[PDB]
Paper text:
Bromo and extra-terminal (BET) proteins provide a recruitment platform initiated by the recognition of acetylated lysines (Kac) by their tandem bromodomains (BRD, Dhalluin et al., 1999, Jacobson et al., 2000, Owen et al., 2000). BETs, like all of the 42 human BRD-containing proteins, contain additional interaction domains that recruit other proteins to the acetylated protein target, forming complex assemblies and contributing to processes such as chromatin remodeling and transcription. Multiple decreased interactors harbor sequences that can directly associate with BET-BRDs in canonical or new BRD-mediated structural binding modes, and we propose that the tandem BRDs present in each BET protein may be capable of simultaneously recruiting both a histone and a second interactor.
Both lysines inserted within the Kac-binding cavity of BRD4/BD1, with K117ac directly engaging the conserved asparagine and K120ac initiating a water-mediated interaction with K117ac, similar to histone H4 peptides (Filippakopoulos et al., 2012).
Author numbering:
A (entry chain B): 115 to 123
B (entry chain A): 42 to 167
Write the structure that this text describes.
Amino acid sequence: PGKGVKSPG
Amino acid sequence: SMNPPPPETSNPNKPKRQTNQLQYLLRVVLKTLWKHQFAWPFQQPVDAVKLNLPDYYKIIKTPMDMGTIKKRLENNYYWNAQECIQDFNTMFTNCYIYNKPGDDIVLMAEALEKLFLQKINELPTE
């Protein structure tokens, strides 16, 4: 699997 | 679960240098990437324990991250700019090996890489 959803800083 | 030791940031046997290109890599290139809204996943080694990615360090045997690069530059760890540029390229390559197109981490890496390449296109002289 992957790292999932990432929000910008 | 365990992370590996991080990449070294100092080595008392490794000759050190400051070059105008290395100075640019810290004060222009790294600075601009570090402040970008997409920088945060790349500011420290991948924490495969916290992310529950038990295969990460099975697949990625040459890890790299901008926290490591920042420290190497601040320590004058490198002899030349190409060593540092290789570390950036390793960081991006690892991301593209482990993750899939369209994953958020990949979109973030792609934008950072474009910015990196724009800045290194204008490396100064000595």
